[PDB]
């Protein structure tokens, strides 16, 4: 079995000549030479089976990306794991190698307006497909936007994704994941349910702002600070918007705050295309019900050079989970993952 940094990375003989990329909670990433396709690929080793929520994330990502097929969404090429369920402790997910991501790129250079336009269009083109499937990504941010060397963009990281369901209350699944504070829509912070596709549009507005200035628009350090950063730019919510907050305690809190005037976008973004700012204004609307949705954002004047429904695929049908995964014990999730991954086995 191949080894890297003294860890088993058992992907041979198909995948060889390993190179360590990086490490996270419960998973290390290597690149590898694929001896069948004659190209280098990315492989993430995941070791989730002792944690219910990691099993949830792993199963959600596998199921979704196996069903989805779109130029602006990362695929799954292959999955390696042990031939018996008992011996399965790790799962290796093989994906197209991508040289960089938007977060790294923004650390590296200021973008031309033509590149900002193109990247925004690709984000929304991918999101159009996702939303056409009735799925919410829920974790859109620059590091989850992969890029190659020729500006082709693919959305990744579908571990937090859910079928849209405004009526169903929380389980703490999304909440216990907090590296995404800066891109979280206000209704997620203020209400426990009622979320729609508009949560993803908010995150895209945050990404657009970040491309304009090479810095996060709302970089709060904690919960209250995060809300203050938003309100310090959008201004105090209106009465109509206070009525989006079902949470009476949250609503009283917002009403207690000192008045803040809206900051004009062109003050904050003095070099931005004025059409880009008009779009940004509609994506970062406090009221999630009035917020622009994906097809309308694509149809906005800022994206007029690209908007092309004849070259924007959508999902054949809504995506569904057979059963809710959130209440299943980790052992049952392990069985489902074994089943989901069976079609990739040599002896299948």
């Amino acid at each position: 079995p191949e080894m890297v940094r003294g860890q088993v990375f058992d992907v041979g003989p198909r995948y060889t000549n390993l190179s360590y990329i990086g490490e996270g909670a419960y998973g290390m990433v290597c690149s590898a030479y694929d001896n069948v396709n004659k190209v280098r690929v990315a492989i993430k080793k995941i070791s989730p089976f002792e944690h219910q929520t990691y099993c949830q994330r792993t199963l959600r990502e596998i199921k979704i990306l196996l069903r989805f097929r779109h130029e602006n969404i990362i695929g799954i090429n292959d999955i390696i794991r042990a031939p018996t369920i008992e011996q399965m402790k790790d799962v290796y997910i093989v994906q197209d190698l991508m040289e960089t991501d938007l977060y790294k790129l923004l650390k590296t250079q200021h973008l031309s307006n033509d590149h900002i336009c193109y990247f925004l269009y690709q984000i929304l083109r991918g999101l159009k497909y996702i939303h056409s499937a009735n799925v919410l990504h829920r974790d859109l941010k620059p590091s989850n936007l992969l890029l190659n060397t020729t500006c082709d963009l693919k959305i990744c990281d579908f571990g937090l994704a859910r079928v849209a369901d405004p009526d169903h209350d929380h389980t703490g699944f999304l909440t216990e994941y907090v590296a995404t504070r800066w891109y979280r829509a206000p209704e997620i912070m203020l209400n426990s349910k009622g979320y729609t596709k508009s949560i993803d549009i908010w995150s895209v507005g945050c990404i657009l702002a970040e491309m304009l200035s090479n810095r996060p628009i709302f970089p709060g350090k904690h919960y209250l600070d995060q809300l203050n950063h938003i309100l310090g730019i959008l201004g105090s919510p209106s009465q109509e918007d206070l009525n989006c907050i079902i949470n009476l305690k949250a609503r009283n809190y917002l009403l207690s705050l000192p008045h803040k005037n809206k900051v004009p976008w062109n003050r904050l973004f003095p070099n931005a295309d004025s059409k880009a700012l008009d779009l940004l204004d509609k994506m970062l609307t406090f009221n999630p019900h009035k917020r622009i949705e994906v097809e309308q954002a694509l149809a906005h004047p800022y994206l007029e050079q690209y908007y092309d429904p004849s070259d924007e695929p959508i999902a054949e049908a809504p995506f569904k989970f057979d059963m809710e995964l959130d209440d299943l014990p980790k052992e049952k999730l392990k069985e489902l993952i074994f089943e989901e991954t069976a079609r990739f086995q040599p002896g299948y």
Partner: protein, 95 residues
């Protein structure tokens, strides 16, 4: 100090309904498994339960801040953040 902390727990309990409390209790249950079998009926009983399990004291606010965040209670959270600010300012007298 102890007085400001007493006032904080009073302020919080004053703003926690019994309905509110069942929510705060649920958010704690995975972290402190004995919670169910303890018969917590008041806000002040909840805070006592947290103190006895080393999750709260006058200088240890981060867990109730965590619970208030996940429970979406910025109104309670802001009383805690303001208490921290106050305590820090008081300390500027004796340096």
């Amino acid at each position: 100090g102890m007085a400001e902390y007493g006032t904080l727990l009073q302020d919080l309990t004053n703003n926690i309904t019994l309905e509110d409390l069942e929510q705060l209790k649920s958010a704690c249950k995975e972290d402190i498994p004995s919670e169910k079998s303890e018969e917590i009926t008041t806000g002040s009983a909840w805070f006592s339960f947290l103190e006895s399990h080393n999750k709260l004291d006058k200088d240890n606010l981060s867990y109730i801040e965590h619970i208030f965040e996940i429970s979406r209670r910025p109104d309670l959270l802001t009383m805690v953040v303001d208490y921290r600010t106050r305590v820090l300012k008081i300390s500027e007298e004796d340096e």
